[PDB]
Design a protein around this ligand. Sequence first.
Ligand SMILES: Cc1ncc(C[n+]2csc(CCO)c2C)c(N)n1
Length: 376
Amino acid sequence: IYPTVILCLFGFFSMMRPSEPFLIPYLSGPDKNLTSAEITNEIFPVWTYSYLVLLLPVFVLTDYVRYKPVIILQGISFIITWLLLLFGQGVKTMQVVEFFYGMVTAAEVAYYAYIYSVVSPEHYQRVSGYCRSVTLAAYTAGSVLAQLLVSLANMSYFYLNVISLASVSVAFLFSLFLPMPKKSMFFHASKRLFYWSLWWAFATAGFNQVLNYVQILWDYKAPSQDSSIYNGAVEAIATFGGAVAAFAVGYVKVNWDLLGELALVVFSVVNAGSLFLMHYTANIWACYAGYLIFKSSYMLLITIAVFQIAVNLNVERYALVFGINTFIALVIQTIMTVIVVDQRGLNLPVSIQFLVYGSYFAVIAGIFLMRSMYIT
Ligand SMILES: Cc1ncc(C[n+]2csc(CCO)c2C)c(N)n1
């Protein structure tokens, strides 16, 4: 339990980042003078570009070099990423910081697969669920902290970014004397399987692309320079809703395989409707409610998808299934980025971008409904 508690506390201090909600308001604020167009069209696409570039090498070398070094590399990457965010300036600096954040988010697979070697060959699911709950609770606490500080304390985003850097610093410091694994997973390595994997890849590509730009539409619909902004509380409530949706899907005892296609198409439709509510609204409270609804209804879909895909295959290659699924998901997301939002592609601003995102989520549901009418 001692490696478990070190991993738990490292995840808590690494995922409690108050600078995550107020990123673009901080990026586009008086501290750095970054216009929205240059952020959207150059800074953020390189994040998913580098994340795809570094997803396969990190996942393939995290067993060769064992799990702890990649976690300490994630800590170093957090340190350098937030050092560039706090002090670096320009646009090339903000592409380098996204390149580092790609590896930051790519080392999460190694962070999650480390716990395979510390407690039991079969209790992987329970401890991984505990670590997931700890990370989501850390994110919720960080968002509540950020919103509460900005609202009551009236505290500048530079000092809030300093707080996030200090948090990831303590997280890295609580990750050197991590018990180095002696157990390595490997050295040199149905009708529902491929179908549900394609569904998961599509849904998570759409989610990773929308999560990158909800903040940009948030300060587009209502400017962050004036009239206040409520990013942190909305993000905290949204991730709390996602967590309770996951826990509710796991908690309820029902035969999903009898008819899950209907109960999941009616959730993909709700996701598409929430995206269209994002795009077509004039207010910002409606957009915040749409974000709440969308992320709750998407975490429902993902918890269902991991429920059916987990029970089919063994725990040992359960991580390999996700490793070969998220690579396809990021390929889909990089084509989606290079045509939709990249400057060298079609150069769509955020204004006419959620229409395309809702069209994506509607086309996925239309393909699902077409698959149901195969007999007809
Ligand atoms: C350093 C850095 N932070 C965040 C993102 C994008 N991003 C991923 S998740 C998330 C929270 C949802 O608002 C955000 C903003 C980035 N590209 N680089």
